[PDB]
Amino acid sequence: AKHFSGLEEAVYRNIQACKELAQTTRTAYGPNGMNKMVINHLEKLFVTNDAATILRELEVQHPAAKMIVMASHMQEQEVGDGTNFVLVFAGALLELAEELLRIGLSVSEVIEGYEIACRKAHEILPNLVCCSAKNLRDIDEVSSLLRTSIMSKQYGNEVFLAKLIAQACVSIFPDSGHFNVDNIRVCKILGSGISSSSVLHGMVFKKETEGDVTSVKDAKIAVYSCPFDGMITETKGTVLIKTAEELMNFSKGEENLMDAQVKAIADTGANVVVTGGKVADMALHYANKYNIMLVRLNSKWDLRRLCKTVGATALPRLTPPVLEEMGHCDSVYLSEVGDTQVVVFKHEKEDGAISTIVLRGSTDNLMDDIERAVDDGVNTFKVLTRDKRLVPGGGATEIELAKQITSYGETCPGLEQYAIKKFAEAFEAIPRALAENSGVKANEVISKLYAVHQEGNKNVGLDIEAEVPAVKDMLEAGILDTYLGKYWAIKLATNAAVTVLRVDQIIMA
Amino acid sequence: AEVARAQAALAVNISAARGLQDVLRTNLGPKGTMKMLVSGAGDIKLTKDGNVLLHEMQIQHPTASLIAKVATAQDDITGDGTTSNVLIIGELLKQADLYISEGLHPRIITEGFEAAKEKALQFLEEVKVSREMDRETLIDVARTSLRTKVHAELADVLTEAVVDSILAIKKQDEPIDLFMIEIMEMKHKSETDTSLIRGLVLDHGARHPDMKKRVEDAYILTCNVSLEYEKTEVNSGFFYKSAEEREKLVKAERKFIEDRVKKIIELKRKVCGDSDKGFVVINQKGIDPFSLDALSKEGIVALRRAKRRNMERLTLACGGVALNSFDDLSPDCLGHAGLVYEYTLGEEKFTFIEKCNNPRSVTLLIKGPNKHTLTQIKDAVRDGLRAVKNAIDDGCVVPGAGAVEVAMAEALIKHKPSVKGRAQLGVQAFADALLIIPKVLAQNSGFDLQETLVKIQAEHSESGQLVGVDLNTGEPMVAAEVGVWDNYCVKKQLLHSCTVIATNILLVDEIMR
Amino acid sequence: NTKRESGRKVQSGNINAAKTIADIIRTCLGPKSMMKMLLDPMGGIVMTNDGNAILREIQVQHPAAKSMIEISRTQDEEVGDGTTSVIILAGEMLSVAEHFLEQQMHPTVVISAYRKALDDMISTLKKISIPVDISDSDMMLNIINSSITTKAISRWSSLACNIALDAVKMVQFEENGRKEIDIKKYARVEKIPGGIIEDSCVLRGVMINKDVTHPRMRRYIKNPRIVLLDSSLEYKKGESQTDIEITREEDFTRILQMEEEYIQQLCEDIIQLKPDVVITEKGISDLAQHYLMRANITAIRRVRKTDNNRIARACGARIVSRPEELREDDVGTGAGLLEIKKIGDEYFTFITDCKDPKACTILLRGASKEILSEVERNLQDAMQVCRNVLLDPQLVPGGGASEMAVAHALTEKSKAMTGVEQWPYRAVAQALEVIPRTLIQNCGASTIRLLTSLRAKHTQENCETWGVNGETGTLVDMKELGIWEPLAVKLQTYKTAVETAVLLLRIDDIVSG
């Protein structure tokens, strides 16, 4: 770092971050998501509509922001819609908390008041348990619950994506009591429409498939990054291609060498060779005759997905597999995935933990936007598995916490009296984020929600009914939340907010 | 080259010293605030702990070196109070400045500090009173000692936990912990938490289907290196650099593996019978799959990944002695732990050893997924274990939260010396230096810093009461009745270390480039 | 290259350089003290009461600065104290004298005034020197104690006394009739790890710590005989290179054993003849030592010829070629005790010796290994007062009273004599008086008013039996107070200072080539 003086980090650094955070979740949160352009070190267009992703990609130069980054990342694992919340609740509380400081309120006196308010907020949340639904045998129930999560993360086809994520997540384990984070793995294959994406189960290798079939039930695999150019460690790993005379004997010789390799795996157990290494011209010929599958050209990502599920372990050497390097899948077969030929394995009773949604788009640009919707939606299913408490649609949750917190200023006083009040406004930052998206007055949005006085129903979503004002029931629309989502978000948000607010000058020479 | 002489030169030293203390003024009590420190190495250390902040990086001055040197002395003995130290030295200097600037000598102020200080050590011996070494009394000190280091919430979680660590001595009373330090750190759901595990816990463990999960009669043999190579205590080389080399390394691991396992199964039979008691083996390196199958089936619990730091502690706890080879060892020299059980939480395995023969090791398990949380909670534990440790050793403890500061100041009563008045300057400056501790709590809290202090002086006038500024509301109170007391060791070593440092600053009137 | 600058221009540059050094050390001397802080170029803190230390670590300048470093080094070698004193005297004299007498115009007269102030000073200071006995310990006790607490040590004062006092007296020179000055090398101190004061022995002889290092090398023989090479050892110890080839394989084997073979031939000679001590000035090894231990003969190794010949007088036996050469005794007795105490696996042989030149290395023990260092410094100051008393039983009852005593003495004489000499002689009178005035600066009040009472006291009562102490800054009967300055330090410090100030006055060219 660099040196600082006059307790600058508290007044100055805290508000710089607030803004940096702002408007990358103050318009890509709620019922319509919005694209932001991120260019990475290998430059390409990348559209983000998700809070956790855009921060991983950014290099945080502010030390004030970095705390807040970590808490968003916990929330990415845990909810995938409490991740959008960390930023907006946290930034807003510091802006308001700065105002209090000027009056003379001490930094910790306010921190007391935010903490009794948070415990209190959590007491209100069982009054914001409005209806309970949970069928994990029904695609129909699941899709409505995910629907507000994926909405925030996409501007596209909301309804169609909701059926694909629901179909994957239910179908894999409809009797599980807990679900996994890498239970669904993405496969990102080029071509076709967005609404031409589909659902398979088990591992898909998105890279080239060759050999020739020979089984559809015996799906034993052995995983290598070791090439078959002429690399074998049971004998010598040297090639002879630097001499013209030898190179010719070697081309002819590669045929027989390849037969030794293929058998060497298979006999001890394989039917499909997983090969991150490369398969020569002559090599490709011997496997076609012999009739063992090849899944050629596998990058590190492709091989790791495979290893983690089956417990097959890769080496850069080729020797017959021991049992720890052997995996098994319930099935394999060769059929097109989205209308492109690949290998599809099945897992849904072997160990599950890998389903595949094929993300399609004639360009990689269309795919990233749907990558965010599914990946966040994995972890939203993991909340609905654990509990059934159903929390109304976005932004309709937020009003009631604000109304009962205002009561909390009046009944408690102290020097915490002020802090509690700004805790109240700070939950209103979330529908003010929707007012800022809609581009109409903040104040008018807030006015309608208090006037009808409905608490757990009414909010201004993103519509053309949000342009000339109206209010709508987000309790009944297929836009629902869950209890734990909000319980986690708030807890880690208040964790993050308070602790940046403590900071004082960096002392260095 | 350049040389600054006389009172001009002394200014250059004291002004710097005062400015460091001003920055750190923000810290102290829980109504203080964490300070963000970034050295030149990245990473956000969020520490309010003064000792950590002085060492990792701090403002360059000559006096930067002095505030750290005394921080170093304080921490090592007592292991609390390094925030506290900073602020009194500062306020002493302020007072000393007013007189020299009038047209007085640095040296006469200095001598009067020595007279002043000596009366104050003697003041401690009266004001102190014996309090229990029973668990709940130590809660009330632990609650206070944790609060001067770090924030309120962080202080509250650790109170009960830290007390149970230091209580599990053998009636071995020292100021510091030496072997009850074990740091285990975990990225977990709970954002901040500390768990009490009594006895020494092992870094990771191996588990097999046939292995004994619950073991009630564990004869530990502690081994080091390894089942990969016979006759070793440090690792052997490797062969894989060529294609041909790979095959060889794996093939002769069969011989190495084959020699080792034999030793262990024959020793198990002497000690346990067949399977009638349980046997624990400590691998500090890789465990080969072939050996995991045989040991596990047999009734032998293999453990994978232990430290050299576990190895030292394990020996004291079980009564066994270390071996660095997997070989036979006499039943006598094996340790006994009467319970071993493995709790698998998150992605790590914590295997406990409980029923410790000799408890001088305990383990605190730090939760915190985030880097920012882990650094807060973990660094509070260390200064916390040693704080409470001072209290159990100490037979007498002193009332706390500025209780003693205001008493000493009034008693030391102006116009008591008459010798030359050289003593008068010092005894007068030292009165106001002590009263920094009220002042900084009052600054942190509502109302004006001196406004709360004059009410403390007034209540102090009423005898039968030691009155200071609360840590949790910044108001006047009888400290004693609330329970907020601080160990003797902090308060004794404070006086010696503050006087010497600030004495030397005034002695410096030549600073050479 | 050549640089030309002439006269009074060069002579100011000298003042400028000297005085800046002199000022803080003028405060550091006395029984009150200051600190000269170095700000290092690498950073960090080093601070001393000694100006030369700080000059050495950085800042050397052409005129005065190099002169002050060089005279002060000679001073350490001599008495061992007063290293501090020289530099102040040299700078105050050059400061005060030069300017008034140059504007008037007379450089060479000033050089002759320095002589007349040297002549006066010796006579008057010797009259006030009071005889005490060196057969009465309680008298020597008072003087030696002051030297210790001039460094401000009172903890380790008592221990220094008991060792030093007896020990230096036994040191002679190799004239043998003296006694007197026992300048370092004929007195020394060497330290042994850790220890405590109950492990301290008084040692009036010399100790060899590379004598009996094993429990199979000489136990206790009251008087040993040390056998010099010759005909019971050999002078040889090396490898032969009669014919050598790198091509030859057997050459590598031959060359390395030839070292070892030679050592066995030396060590076999001692075995066959039976010494009880052998001395080698070449320096044997551990491994060479081993062969001597089966015969039960101690080796003294890593020594030097001047040490073994003095040590032979001390031990109680003269230098003999072999144990079969026995002729007329140069010393037939010399050691009163042989004592051996073990710390680690290294044995340390103490040998008490009376009235022989020796080397007189006395034992010491600190509280720790660090403290051995501080203890060794206090003895360097203590053994100095023993050589002072042993030389001249007459010594000053000074205490800064002494500088003052001479200063007033000269003022009286300048007035009486009249003549062209009186103005340069009056200038130097005053230079000497600046110094005791600074001691009163630490104490308080108007320094010059207090100094006036000293002036009146010198003619009326006494010069310095009733003098001034710098800790009171008032007149105190210096004899009753038991603060006495060592005459030997004051005599030499004042001789060199005039000369270094006199050298700079003579210089009126500084070239840089």
Question: What DSSP assignment string belongs to B25-82?
Answer: GG-SSSSS--EEE--SS---EEE--HHHHHHH----SSHHHHHHHHHHHHHHHTS--H
Calculate helix-pair angle for C447-460, C434-443, nearest 10 degrees: 120
DSSP states of C41-81 as a string?
SS-SEEEES-HHHHHHHS---TTHHHHHHHHHHHHHHHTS-
- For residues B48 and B32, the answer to whether their CB atoms sit within 8 Å is yes
| Chain C residue with the nearest C-alpha to that of B107 | C442
For residues A222 and B167, what is the distance between their CA atoms, to the nearest angstrom?
55
Q: Evaluate whether A358 touches A337 at the Cβ level (below 8 Å).
A: yes
Using CA atoms, how far apart are residues A343 and B337, in angstroms rounded to an integer?
53
Rounded Cα distance between A141 and C269, Å, is: 105
Residue labelled with tokens 């009052």: B442
Contact A108 B34 (CB under 8 A): no
For residue C359, give both structure tokens. Answer: 């080397």
Show the DSSP H helices in A41-106 as ranges.
51-57, 63-78, 82-103
Q: What angle do CA A261, A267, A269 make, to 5 degrees?
A: 105
Please tell me which of the candidates B33, B152, B244 has its beta carbon nearest to residue A504.
Answer: B33
Q: Which residues pair with B184 in a beta bridge?
A: B365
Helices B403-411 and B422-434: angle between axes, nearest 10 degrees? 160
Question: What's phi and psi for B117, nearest 5 deg?
Answer: -65, -45
* CA–CA gap between residue A21 and residue A324 (Å, rounded): 46
Instruction: State the Cα–Cα distance between residues C227 and B287, nearest whole angstrom.
Output: 64
Which residues of B are annotated as catalytic? 49, 82-83, 383
- What's the DSSP call for residue B330? -
CA gap C184, C387 in Å, rounded? 10
Tokens read off for C114: 């320095």
Tally C-beta pairs within 8 A across B and C.
63
Q: Quick check: A228 and A278 in contact, CB under 8 A?
A: yes
CB contact under 8 A, B40 and A1: yes
Q: Which of residues 36-55 of C touch B (CB under 8 A)?
A: 36-39, 43-45, 47, 54
CA pair distance A137, B402, nearest whole angstrom? 65
Question: How many CB pairs below 8 Å do chains A and B form together?
Answer: 108
| Cα–Cα distance for residue pair C261/C271, rounded to 1 Å | 16
CA angle A255, A261, A266 (to 5 degrees): 125
Q: Which residues contact A159 (CB under 8 A, 6 or more apart)?
A: none
CB-based contact B39 A71, cutoff 8 Å? no
Q: What's the CA gap between C101 and C99, in Å, rounded?
A: 6
- Sign of the Cα pseudo-torsion (C448, C450, C454, C460, in order): positive
DSSP, collapsed to helix, strand or coil, labels residue A432 as helix
Task: Give every CB contact of residue B200 below 8 A, 6+ residues apart in sequence.
Answer: B182, B310, B313, B314, B317, B353, B356, B361, B362, B363
Closest C-alpha among B382, B421, B403, B359 to residue B491: B403
Buried b (16+ CB within 10 A) or exposed e, B345-383: eeebbbbbbbbbeebbbbbbbbbbbbbbbbbbbbbbbbb
Residue A420 half-sphere exposure toward CB, CA atoms < 13 A: 21
Beta bridge pairs of residue B282? B222, B303
Q: Please name the amino acid found at residue A266.
A: A
Query: Which residues on B lie below 8 Å from A109 (Cβ)?
Result: 31, 445-446
Sequential DSSP letters for C412-423: HHHHHH-STTHH
Experimental method: cryo-EM
Q: Is B503 annotated as a binding residue?
A: no
Supply angle C-alpha A434, A437, A439, rounded to 5. 110
Asked whether the beta carbons of A313 and A307 are under 8 A apart, the reply is yes
Residue A506: CB atoms within 10 A of its CB come to: 21
Select which of C213, C307, C381, C438 is catalytic: C381
Q: Following CA atoms A333, A336, A340, A342 in sequence, which dihedral angle do they give, to the nearest 10 degrees?
A: -10
Asked whether A13 and A499 are in contact (CB, 8 A), the reply is no
Is B468 assigned a ligand-binding role in the annotation?
no
* CB contact at 8 A, B303 and B206: yes
Between the CA of residue B364 and those of B199, B368, B377, C313, what are the distances in Å? 10, 13, 11, 67
Q: CB-based contact (8 Å) between C152 and chain B?
A: no
> Which string of DSSP letters, residue by residue, matches B434-466?
HTHHHHHHHHHSSS-HHHHHHHHHHHHHSSS--
Q: B191 in contact with A at a CB cutoff of 8 Å?
A: yes
Rounded to the nearest 5 degrees, what angle is found at the Cα of A26, between the Cα atoms of A23 and A28?
95
Element (H, E) at C408: helix C401-417
Q: Do C34 and B66 touch (CB under 8 A)?
A: no
Q: Which residues of A touch B30 (CB under 8 A)?
A: 108
Closest chain A residue to B54, measured at CA: A507
Cα–Cα distance between A457 and A459 in angstroms, integer? 7
Give the position of tokens 């410096």: B508
Cβ-based contacts of C32 with chain B (< 8 Å): 107
CA distance A203 to A201: 7
Contacts of A287-291 spanning 24+ positions with Cβ under 8 A: A287/A210, A287/A211, A287/A212, A287/A258, A287/A262, A288/A210, A288/A211, A288/A212, A290/A259, A290/A262, A290/A263, A291/A211, A291/A212, A291/A213, A291/A214
How many helices (H) and strands (E) would you count in chain B? 17, 20
* Sign of torsion over alpha carbons B288, B291, B297, B299: negative
Q: What CA–CA distance (Å, rounded) separates B222 from B472? A: 48
* A458: nearest Cα among A402, A397, A404: A397
Given CB atoms, is A59 within the 8 Å cutoff of chain B?
Answer: no
Distance CA A341, CA A218 (A): 20
CA distance C293 to chain B (A): 35
Subunits with at least 3 CB pairs below 8 A relative to chain C?
Answer: B
Asked if the Cβ–Cβ distance from A503 to B444 is below 8 Å, we say no
Please give the C-alpha separations between residue C171 and each of B329, C141, C165, C353, in angstroms, as whole numbers.
Answer: 62, 19, 11, 9
B3 touches C: beta carbon within 8 Å: yes
Main-chain phi, psi angles of A275, to 5 degrees: -140, 110
Q: What is the helix (H) or strand (E) element at residue A426, kind and residue range?
A: helix A417-438
Which of the following is catalytic: C84, C124, C213, C493? C84
Interface contact B8, partner C, CB < 8 A: no
Q: Tokens at residue A19, please?
A: 């803004």
Distance of alpha carbon A260 from alpha carbon B355, whole angstroms: 58
Neighbours of A329 (CB within 10 A): 23
| Two structure tokens written together for B399 | 């009332």
Bridge-based pairing state of the strands C335-343 and B396-399: unpaired
Overall size of chain A counted in residues:
509
List the subunits that have 3+ CB pairs under 8 angstroms with B: A, C
Q: How far apart are CA C351 and CA C358, in angstroms?
A: 11
Q: Which residue of B has its CA nearest to C45?
A: B62
C126 is in an annotated binding site: no
- What element of type H or E holds A293? strand A293-295
Annotated active-site residue C381? The verdict is: yes
> Closest by alpha carbon to C291, among C261, C329, C264, C328?
C264
Q: Quick one: resolution in A?
A: 7.7
Q: Rounded CA gap, B14 and B63, in Å?
A: 8
Q: Is B53 on the interface with A (CB under 8 A)?
A: yes
- Active-site pick, C83, C298, C361, C493: C83
Interface contact flag, A507 B58, Cβ < 8 Å: yes
The reply, when asked if residue C92 is annotated as ligand binding, is no
- Give Cα separations from C481 to B30, B137, B334, C450, C477 (angstroms): 54, 53, 69, 19, 6
Torsion (CA) A226, A232, A238, A243 in degrees, nearest 10 = -90
Decide if B66 and C36 are in contact by the 8 Å CB cutoff: no
Q: Please name the amino acid found at residue C179.
A: K
Residue pair B510/C24 in contact by the 8 Å Cβ criterion: yes
Contact: A507, B35; criterion CB under 8 Å: yes
Q: Measure the CA–CA gap between B443 and A90, rounded to whole angstroms.
A: 27
Q: What distance in Å separates residue A117's CA from the closest CA in chain B?
A: 15
Q: Largest Cα–Cα distance of chain A, in whole Å?
A: 95
Q: Which distant-in-sequence residues (6+ apart) come within 8 Å of C499 by Cβ?
A: none
> Which amino acid would we find at residue B303?
L
Map residue C394 onto helix, strand or coil: strand
Contact B272, B320 (CB under 8 A): no
- Residue C330: active-site member: no
The answer to whether residue B420 neighbours chain C at the CB level (below 8 Å) is yes
* Structure tokens given for B393: 């050793």
> Cα-flanking dihedrals φ and ψ of residue A126, to 5°?
-70, 5
CB contact under 8 A, B66 and C45: yes
Residue of C nearest to B63 (CA): C45
The CA distance from A41 to A35, in Å, is 19
DSSP state of C269: H
B103 assigned to a ligand binding site: no
Q: Do C442 and B107 touch (CB under 8 A)?
A: yes
Q: Which residues of chain C lie closer than 8 angstroms to B509, CB-CB? A: 24, 27, 34-35
Q: Indicate the DSSP class of residue A12.
A: I
Please indicate whether, in this complex, the C-beta atoms of B38 and A234 are within 8 angstroms of each other.
no
Q: CA nearest B409: which of B119, B64, B144, B102? A: B119
What are the DSSP E strand ranges found in A389-498? 390-392, 458-459, 472-473, 480-482
Give φ, ψ of C169 to 5 degrees: -60, -35
CA-angle at B22, arms to B469 and A107, nearest 5°: 60
Residues of chain C in contact with residue B66, where contact means CB-CB under 8 angstroms, are: 45
Name the token pair of C233: 């050892």
CA distance A270 to B4: 84
A316: amino acid identity, one letter:
P
* φ, ψ at B466 (rounded to 5°): -115, 130
CB atoms within 10 A of CB C458: 22
Residues of B in contact with C444 (CB under 8 A): 105, 108, 420-422
Question: Chain B: residue nearest A77 by CA?
Answer: B189
Please enumerate, by residue number, every residue of A annotated as part of a binding site: 29-30, 81-85, 151-153, 394, 481, 486
CA distance A375 to A369: 11
Residues 6+ apart with CB under 8 A from C269: C232, C233, C234
Minimum Cα–Cα distance from B32: chain A residue: A108
CB-neighbour burial class of residue B209 (10 A; exposed 0-12, middle 13-18, buried 19+): exposed
d(CA A188, CA A359): 5
Q: What is the rounded distance in angstroms from the CA atom of residue B348 to the CA atom of residue B350?
A: 6
| Tokens standing for residue C147 | 């030297």
State the Cα–Cα distance between residues A451 and A473, nearest whole angstrom.
15
User: Are A380 and A485 within 8 A, CB to CB?
Assistant: yes
Chains touching A (at least 3 CB pairs under 8 A) are: B
Q: How many CB atoms neighbour CB B390 within 10 A?
A: 28
